[PDB]
Amino acid sequence: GRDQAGITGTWYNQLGSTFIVTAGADGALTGTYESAVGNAESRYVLTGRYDSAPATDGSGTALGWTVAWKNNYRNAHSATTWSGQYVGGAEARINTQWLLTVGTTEANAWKSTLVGHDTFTKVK
Amino acid sequence: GRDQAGITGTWYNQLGSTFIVTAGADGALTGTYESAVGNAESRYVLTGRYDSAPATDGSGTALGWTVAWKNNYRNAHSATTWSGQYVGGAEARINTQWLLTVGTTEANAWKSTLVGHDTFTKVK
Amino acid sequence: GRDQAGITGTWYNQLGSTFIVTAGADGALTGTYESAVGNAESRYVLTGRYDSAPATDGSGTALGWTVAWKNNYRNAHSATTWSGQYVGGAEARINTQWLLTVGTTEANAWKSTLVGHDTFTKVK
Amino acid sequence: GRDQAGITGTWYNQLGSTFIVTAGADGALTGTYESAVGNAESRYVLTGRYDSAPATDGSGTALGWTVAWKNNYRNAHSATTWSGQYVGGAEARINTQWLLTVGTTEANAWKSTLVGHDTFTKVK
Numbered sequence: 001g002r003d004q005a006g007i008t009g010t011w012y013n014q015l016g017s018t019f020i021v022t023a024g025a026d027g028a029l030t031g032t033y034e035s036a037v038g039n040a041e042s043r044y045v046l047t048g049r050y051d052s053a054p055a056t057d058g059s060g061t062a063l064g065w066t067v068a069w070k071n072n073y074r075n076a077h078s079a080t081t082w083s084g085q086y087v088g089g090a091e092a093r094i095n096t097q098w099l100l101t102v103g104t105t106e107a108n109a110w111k112s113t114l115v116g117h118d119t120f121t122k123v124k
Numbered sequence: 125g126r127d128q129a130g131i132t133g134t135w136y137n138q139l140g141s142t143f144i145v146t147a148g149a150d151g152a153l154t155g156t157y158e159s160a161v162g163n164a165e166s167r168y169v170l171t172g173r174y175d176s177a178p179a180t181d182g183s184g185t186a187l188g189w190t191v192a193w194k195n196n197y198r199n200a201h202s203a204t205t206w207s208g209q210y211v212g213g214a215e216a217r218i219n220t221q222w223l224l225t226v227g228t229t230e231a232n233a234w235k236s237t238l239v240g241h242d243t244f245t246k247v248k
Numbered sequence: 249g250r251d252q253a254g255i256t257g258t259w260y261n262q263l264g265s266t267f268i269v270t271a272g273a274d275g276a277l278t279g280t281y282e283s284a285v286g287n288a289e290s291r292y293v294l295t296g297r298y299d300s301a302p303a304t305d306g307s308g309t310a311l312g313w314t315v316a317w318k319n320n321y322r323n324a325h326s327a328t329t330w331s332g333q334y335v336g337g338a339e340a341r342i343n344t345q346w347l348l349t350v351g352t353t354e355a356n357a358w359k360s361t362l363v364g365h366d367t368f369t370k371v372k
Numbered sequence: 373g374r375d376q377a378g379i380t381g382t383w384y385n386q387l388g389s390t391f392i393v394t395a396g397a398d399g400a401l402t403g404t405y406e407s408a409v410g411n412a413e414s415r416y417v418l419t420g421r422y423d424s425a426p427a428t429d430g431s432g433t434a435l436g437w438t439v440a441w442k443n444n445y446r447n448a449h450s451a452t453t454w455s456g457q458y459v460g461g462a463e464a465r466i467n468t469q470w471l472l473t474v475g476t477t478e479a480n481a482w483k484s485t486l487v488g489h490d491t492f493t494k495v496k
Contacts, residue, residue, distance in 0.1 A: 027192050047171040049192035055201050059227040064190040064205035068151050068173035077179050081188035081205035083223035097223050097237050099207035103183040110285055113221050115363035117489045239487035241365045275440050295419040297440035303449050307475040312438040312453035316399050316421035325427050329436035329453035331471035345471050345485050347455035351431040361469050
């Protein structure tokens with residue numbers, strides 16, 4: 001991975017959530033997510049993928065990951081996926097949009113999925 | 125996983141894409157995605173997570189997964205995440221929404237991310 | 249409008265909701281929305297815009313509209329916007345994605361917005 | 373409208389786009405949008421709706437609006453809808469998510485719709 005080192009480490013969103021991730025040379029993302037907002041608590045497992053050979057034209061590095069909101073302490077019966085890109089440099093960022101789906105009855109399916117955005121930085 | 129067997133197997137979306145996945149008892153999703161539409165070709169690795177202890181109130185099972193669109197044949201410098209829920213039964217379904225992010229320059233970041241929806245079935 | 253007549257009329261989504269709209273030659277959409285699902289009841293006012301000079305290359309006609317979920321009978325303190333395109337022909341369709349935002353406290357803002365999709369047809 | 377005066381006026385997003393709007397007492401939004409980014413130029417008409425009787429529990433005021441990207445100078449054959457809420461006070465904000473749909477062939481429909489977010493302020 002060109003940005004395997006850039007991505008690997010700890011990231012913080014604008015809400016104080018904490019995203020610890022290892023980027024493998026094959027394109028794997030693996031780590032933990034600790035949410036600061038919502039119906040979550042400790043750490044949760046995360047897995048995802050990233051482009052391990054990004055364009056060198058100054059473009060960002062596409063990636064995404066999933067957290068299922070079940071751990072030893074909570075089950076929210078829901079999952080969030082983040083889709084975004086890593087932008088390296090002095091103020092490195094991971095810019096994302098996310099989809100959070102809650103398990104629902106078929107009658108409530110139309111309102112199963114929230115959408116939002118998170119900006120992750122290396123500081124805070 | 126309660127629906128570890130329900131989820132594990134091959135799924136087909138309304139476009140003919142093919143989603144082969146193994147659901148682990150710990151909540152891991154792992155498999156391959158073969159797209160029928162877009163700037164993709166063979167199989168791509170996928171990883172994700174699911175709720176391995178869904179509510180038994182008839183609600184669906186939340187899950188999501190990521191594909192980075194890089195394999196031995198293509199690099200689209202992009203990643204898609206699907207967020208949705210598995211609904212078991214005679215006409216089992218995985219109902220999803222997805223976010224596709226393309227690596228972009230900062231000037232083009234505002235248009236980096238497509239949104240869509242996929243319905244997966246066990247047939248077709 | 250090239251599809252001013254194509255768009256103008258009554259549309260039904262996969263849920264049984266009813267969308268009655270007039271497309272003006274200037275690009276205005278105006279009408280009423282009657283929801284079949286959710287925390288809504290009678291008709292609600294809708295307004296929006298459409299491309300009154302679509303490409304003739306077989307492409308669809310971009311449009312969108314908003315409903316605020318307040319009428320004489322209900323106030324859900326929320327608004328939905330549909331973004332999509334009209335596809336003419338024997339099986340004419342309006343294919344959309346929508347965002348539903350609920351008024352929230354700042355603490356709950358991160359979960360203010362649902363995302364979904366609706367397909368509208370001239371029949372049902 | 374409780375926030376008819378709060379909403380009415382000029383708003384600027386983080387990109388420098390300019391959103392001039394009048395909120396009617398019936399819940400109408402009408403105005404112009406002048407984009408600073410993308411394939412747009414001068415002003416474009418906008419119309420939308422807002423909740424003219426928001427909850428007084430400190431919650432925001434739900435609203436949305438549509439711009440079709442056609443004016444006397446440009447036709448992008450596309451439309452954007454913003455869905456969000458107005459938050460009053462010393463640092464008043466309109467927090468939104470948006471969907472931009474481009475008219476496409478049926479073969480390209482799956483990639484017709486971009487998603488993003490805009491934060492509007494009274495300054496800048």
